[PDB]
Amino acid sequence: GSARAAVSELMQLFPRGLFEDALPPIVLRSQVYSLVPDRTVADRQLKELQEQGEIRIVQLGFDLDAHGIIFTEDYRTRVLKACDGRPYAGAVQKFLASVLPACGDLSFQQDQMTQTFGFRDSEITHLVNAGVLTVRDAGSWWLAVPGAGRFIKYFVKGRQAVLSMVRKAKYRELLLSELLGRRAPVVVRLGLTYHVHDLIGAQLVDCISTTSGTLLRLPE
Template identity: 30%
Template structure:
């Protein structure tokens, strides 16, 4: 299912400077701020700029077709003013540029995905499910047109969901089941009458996110001062997560689990004091 998540697609917003493979890749990388080290992009002044660069830098993962998503914690690591991040995310959400998703990782994690990417992801999932035009699969069209367009929050109650879907046609329980089976909605545990909007196919990456966090903290905790030079840490390969080191470090720094310290020999990453 690579067609749904190609590298070329992820680079679509980045200007092309040459038709030569390596040179183009290098140009794309530099245009995207995709520098060799994370230390160069730990400070942005604008949330949308940070989002666009992190979207391009989203790790390419084999066998998982998920459009690039960014964690709110990663934005906190790169845009110093958290209130500004929250405010700008809220504006972008209201303007329907992106959507926010509550993640079931046991923490207060939120993922951000550009709306166009999310709509494409839904199309990919429907295609893979063998969705035909008409029949019960028409619910996906109703969902995109009537639900996503008017419900911008991260959750929705059953009654409101049915009411919005009914703008497209007669709603049956099997329609709702189809949306849940596709991974587009998940039931809230506390209130089964309410659903979270979800990113389809994200399950294995969320597992990797949780395990990668533990792996990095454990790696640093075993060191004498619970710290390591960023340059050395970036070279480490993660065993427990398909996501790359940069993705995890941004998340852990932004969530306060790790802190950074600039020294004459380079940036140090250390486990934050409890």
């Protein structure tokens, strides 16, 4: 179990064509813990591999522990094709050439951004224009991924959906082989395989192994 390997698999699962090649392929830290049993180390590998500049971990808002992952190169290649042709395309390019390869912190302070990156107080709206700078608070702001709205809406919808059917299942159990074999519900479009990894990481289910494969149960 390697975090380099772990993140790669999730990346493959992503429905790339579903979002018209605009949102870079997000993979969650929750589903990272699914492939690698020892979470204790998964964070440690991704930590140095964060400052290694080959990954971007973006903080999301669907829960307190919402930390998404965006591929660095793909994060780069997609912002220009989204920013260019727009009024905000000006200093977002600077943000890219200066801020991204010099820092890896999840949220930038006011004095940090203005001084270290030499940002004015007028162009800062342009980064807020299309998913570049979120709003942590008055003094700090988390790093944004453009066009993240649609993803989480489907993501949250999907999580609820899978949770619901699992509960509905007779005797409140549902075999994992019975998810893949059965057609994915139309309510969730991110992929049934994508979400089942999420609850495993979120510990909403436990991977109980038996003679008939592995089973998931709500916590007792």
